[PDB]
Amino acid sequence: PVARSWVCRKTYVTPRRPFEKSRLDQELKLIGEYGLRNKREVWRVKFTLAKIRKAARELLTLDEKDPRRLFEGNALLRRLVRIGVLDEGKMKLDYILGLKIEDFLERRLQTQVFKLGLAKSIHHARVLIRQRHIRVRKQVVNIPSFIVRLDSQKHIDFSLRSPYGGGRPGRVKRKNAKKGQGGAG
Amino acid sequence: HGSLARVGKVRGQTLKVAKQEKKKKRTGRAKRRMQYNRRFVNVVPTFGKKKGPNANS
Amino acid sequence: DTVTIRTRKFMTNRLLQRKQMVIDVLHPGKATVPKTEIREKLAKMYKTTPDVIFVFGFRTHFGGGKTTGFGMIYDSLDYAKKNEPKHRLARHGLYEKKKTSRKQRKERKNRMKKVRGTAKANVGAG
Amino acid sequence: GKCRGLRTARKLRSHRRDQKWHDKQYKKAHLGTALKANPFGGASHAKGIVLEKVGVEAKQPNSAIRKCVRVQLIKNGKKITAFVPNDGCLNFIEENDEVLVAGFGRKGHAVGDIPGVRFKVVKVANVSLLALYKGKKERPR
RNA sequence: GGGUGACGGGGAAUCAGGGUUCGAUUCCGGAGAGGGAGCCUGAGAAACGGCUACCACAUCCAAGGAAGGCAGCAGGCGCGCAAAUUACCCACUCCCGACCCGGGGAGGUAGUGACGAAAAAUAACAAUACAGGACUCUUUCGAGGCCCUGUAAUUGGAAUGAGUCCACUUUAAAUCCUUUAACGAGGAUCCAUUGGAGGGCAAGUCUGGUGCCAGCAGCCGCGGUAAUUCCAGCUCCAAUAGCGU
Numbered sequence: 117p118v119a120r121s122w123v124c125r126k127t128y129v130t131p132r133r134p135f136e137k138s139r140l141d142q143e144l145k146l147i148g149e150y151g152l153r154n155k156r157e158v159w160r161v162k163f164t165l166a167k168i169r170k171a172a173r174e175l176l177t178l179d180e181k182d183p184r185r186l187f188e189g190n191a192l193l194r195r196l197v198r199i200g201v202l203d204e205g206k207m208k209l210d211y212i213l214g215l216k217i218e219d220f221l222e223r224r225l226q227t228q229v230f231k232l233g234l235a236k237s238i239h240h241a242r243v244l245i246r247q248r249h250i251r252v253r254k255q256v257v258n259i260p261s262f263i264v265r266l267d268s269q270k271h272i273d274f275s276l277r278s279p280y281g282g283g284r285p286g287r288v289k290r291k292n293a294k295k296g297q298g299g300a301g
Numbered sequence: 302h303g304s305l306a307r308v309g310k311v312r313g314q315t316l317k318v319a320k321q322e323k324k325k326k327r328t329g330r331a332k333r334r335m336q337y338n339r340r341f342v343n344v345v346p347t348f349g350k351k352k353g354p355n356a357n358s
Numbered sequence: 359d360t361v362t363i364r365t366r367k368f369m370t371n372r373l374l375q376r377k378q379m380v381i382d383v384l385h386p387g388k389a390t391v392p393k394t395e396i397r398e399k400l401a402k403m404y405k406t407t408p409d410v411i412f413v414f415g416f417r418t419h420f421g422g423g424k425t426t427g428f429g430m431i432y433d434s435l436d437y438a439k440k441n442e443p444k445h446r447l448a449r450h451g452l453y454e455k456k457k458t459s460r461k462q463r464k465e466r467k468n469r470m471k472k473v474r475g476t477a478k479a480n481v482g483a484g
Numbered sequence: 485g486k487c488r489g490l491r492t493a494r495k496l497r498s499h500r501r502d503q504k505w506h507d508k509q510y511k512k513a514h515l516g517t518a519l520k521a522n523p524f525g526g527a528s529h530a531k532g533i534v535l536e537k538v539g540v541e542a543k544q545p546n547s548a549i550r551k552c553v554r555v556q557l558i559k560n561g562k563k564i565t566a567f568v569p570n571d572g573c574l575n576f577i578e579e580n581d582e583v584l585v586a587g588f589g590r591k592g593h594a595v596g597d598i599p600g601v602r603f604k605v606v607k608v609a610n611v612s613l614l615a616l617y618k619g620k621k622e623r624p625r
Numbered sequence: 626g627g628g629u630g631a632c633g634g635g636g637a638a639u640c641a642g643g644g645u646u647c648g649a650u651u652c653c654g655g656a657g658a659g660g661g662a663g664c665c666u667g668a669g670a671a672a673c674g675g676c677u678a679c680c681a682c683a684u685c686c687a688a689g690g691a692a693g694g695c696a697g698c699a700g701g702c703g704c705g706c707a708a709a710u711u712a713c714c715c716a717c718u719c720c721c722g723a724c725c726c727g728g729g730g731a732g733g734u735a736g737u738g739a740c741g742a743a744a745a746a747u748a749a750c751a752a753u754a755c756a757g758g759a760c761u762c763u764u765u766c767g768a769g770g771c772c773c774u775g776u777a778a779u780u781g782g783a784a785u786g787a788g789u790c791c792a793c794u795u796u797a798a799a800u801c802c803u804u805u806a807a808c809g810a811g812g813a814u815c816c817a818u819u820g821g822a823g824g825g826c827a828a829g830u831c832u833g834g835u836g837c838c839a840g841c842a843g844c845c846g847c848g849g850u851a852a853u854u855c856c857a858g859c860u861c862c863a864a865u866a867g868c869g870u
């Protein structure tokens with residue numbers, strides 16, 4: 117008897133046929149186009165898509181004008197529009213199942229940095245993010261995979277308390293200013 | 302029948318060799334970058350009856 | 359000079375003899391103000407000294423220009439030395455405690471269980 | 485054909501019940517039999533002491549001696565003829581030294597060219613034989 | 626009647642739809658305090674941090690006698706393939722008492738911890754030398770560069786956390802994160818790892834050694850002097866703080 121949770125899940129599912137070739141080809145291409153650190157980070161997106169797909173399927177099995185369907189399906193569509201994946205007007209559930217990986221990768225801080233100019237390559241973008249150089253809204257979102265809400269897109273920029281954003285310069289230039297001051301001069 | 306003598310005959314009598322040196326290899330994302338770059342942009346040439354990522358004529 | 363403060367979820371707990379609220383602290387580019395500086399800042403804001411103010415539980419956020427924690431103000435010290443945790447008082451030196459060290463008191467009391475009556479022996483013990 | 489009807493459940497479920505025994509894998513796992521025959525008393529590995537290095541001779545199409553280790557297990561007193569894998573590794577093993585022994589990868593059924601060796605040695609005196617083969621840890625003295 | 630590698634359940638693992646296996650284990654219910662039995666008090670026990678016997682273990686004895694029960698928490702021995710520190714505190718959560726005040730190894734806090742789970746670094750950008758190809762230009766050769774990709778030179782400064790560390794915060798008192806000054810990167814450094822590279826199955830008919838040996842190999846097989854399969858070196862493949870059995 118304690119406090120504590122013990123409530124945790126896995127966020128991804130590995131592929132069965134582990135050397136398919138065609139699968140490996142597609143996953144690596146995804147890694148290239150969006151600078152992912154690892155195969156499984158792809159598989160995490162795939163899996164969050166899959167859950168959605170299961171949820172959608174389940175709703176389509178319910179008869180239309182079944183309360184359970186109406187409410188839950190709408191909430192799912194509302195949730196999906198919130199992130200910038202579905203368009204308003206396209207909201208009616210069948211359109212979820214025609215919806216792919218790339219749409220969900222397209223809304224990461226790492227993209228919506230590199231997408232909003234700001235970066236200079238996607239790997240740079242990922243480095244920026246880690247190095248506390250870019251702030252969403254008013255917090256320094258350290259994390260690349262931060263799914264950027266459509267609501268929250270236009271508030272992406274550099275972090276105030278940083279070299280790029282317009283603050284104190286980093287420790288390399290500080291050193292090279294000390295070297296020019298005392299050593300050379 | 303048959304002895305238990307030779308046991309590590311071949312592990313014994315191989316010609317010993319240094320393990321060379323080259324470089325600090327790119328790890329993590331950087332590695333994955335590198336490999337995606339060298340299958341999907343750099344080469345992509347005119348074909349001549351299939352490829353080989355460790356071929357040797 | 360440049361910290362700033364706000365006062366969230368304010369409430370007048372009449373029957374604990376206190377005002378109690380959620381302190382907000384903006385402070386961009388400085389290293390989480392010590393609680394003494396919050397007290398004097400709250401003292402001049404609420405016009406009622408530091409001596410009846412008790413503040414704790416300050417958590418900074420990420421990025422690091424916003425902390426947030428809980429604070430309450432007492433009517434007098436006489437009230438605050440009654441309706442407060444003992445630790446929170448000696449947090450600023452006014453109701454300090456013994457240095458017996460739990461294990462020593464229990465050991466002492468397991469001897470004593472060994473003996474009857476003798477107030478002197480039960481005073482001694484260990 | 486099948487019993488098929490609607491108040492059959494019993495006949496159906498009981499017939500299945502009686503047949504399940506004709507399955508091979510299931511009878512293994514439900515008659516105690518095999519857990520009795522396991523030297524590794526339903527166990528993943530077993531510590532046991534080496535009491536003779538024995539050359540095993542491989543099965544015909546391959547000709548080769550297979551350098552095994554006669555292990556008496558500790559939990560039982562049930563003797564074993566485990567395999568010392570990888571080249572010249574039998575030399576690391578010296579008599580009376582406390583090997584850990586695992587399965588050979590087939591959960592029974594002997595493997596390979598070897599006849600009847602169900603087990604492979606993993607750790608000789610708490611060390612791990614991979615580390616000795618690689619050259620990482622060493623046999624203490 | 627016998628067995629159970631049988632405490633019941635909530636539930637857990639897989640899973641299309643059906644299913645199969647698991648459930649000692651934080652909630653609920655049961656049962657037990659070495660084994661059996663008997664009881665005192667009490668509203669409530671057939672109590673075990675209550676007694677009385679016996680059996681099994683075992684402890685002082687001045688040898689008449691006397692005392693004992695961790696399947697509480699730590700820890701030890703043993704068993705074993707198989708499992709943590711004799712730490713700090715009543716601050717939280719609740720309990721008990723005559724009690725606003727005392728007690729609680731309930732409980733909370735630290736330590737160990739690759740059981741398992743979530744996040745997520747090990748580099749990024751530039752001009753160079755170049756090495757290439759959609760465009761424009763050119764019969765071809767060559768060139769203009771919005772586009773770019775590899776290898777170098779670390780060439781270039783810029784960026785940064787690991788870490789070291791004042792201080793604040795945290796907190797019962799601490800830490801840990803979080804906040805934050807000051808130091809902190811040329812890779813010869815702050816060095817990624819496990820397993821593979823005949824097929825199944827992603828990836829060398831490369832070089833050296835050994836010659837049915839030594840060894841690999843879940844299976845098919847490879848090894849008897851040009852070994853794609855062994856021991857090595859090279860390069861390559863997979864996953865990657867993980868990966869083998």
Ligand SMILES: [Mg+2]
Binds near residue numbers: 629
């Ligand atoms: Mg049983």
Ligand SMILES: [Mg+2]
């Ligand atoms: Mg219970």
Ligand SMILES: [Mg+2]
Binds near residue numbers: 659
């Ligand atoms: Mg016991």
Ligand SMILES: [Mg+2]
């Ligand atoms: Mg009982």
Ligand SMILES: [Mg+2]
Binds near residue numbers: 673
């Ligand atoms: Mg009893």
Ligand SMILES: [Mg+2]
Binds near residue numbers: 695
């Ligand atoms: Mg006890």
Ligand SMILES: [Mg+2]
Binds near residue numbers: 708
């Ligand atoms: Mg363990």
Ligand SMILES: [Mg+2]
């Ligand atoms: Mg406990």
Ligand SMILES: [Mg+2]
């Ligand atoms: Mg893990």
Ligand SMILES: [Mg+2]
Binds near residue numbers: 747
């Ligand atoms: Mg490193």
Ligand SMILES: [Mg+2]
Binds near residue numbers: 826
């Ligand atoms: Mg293969």
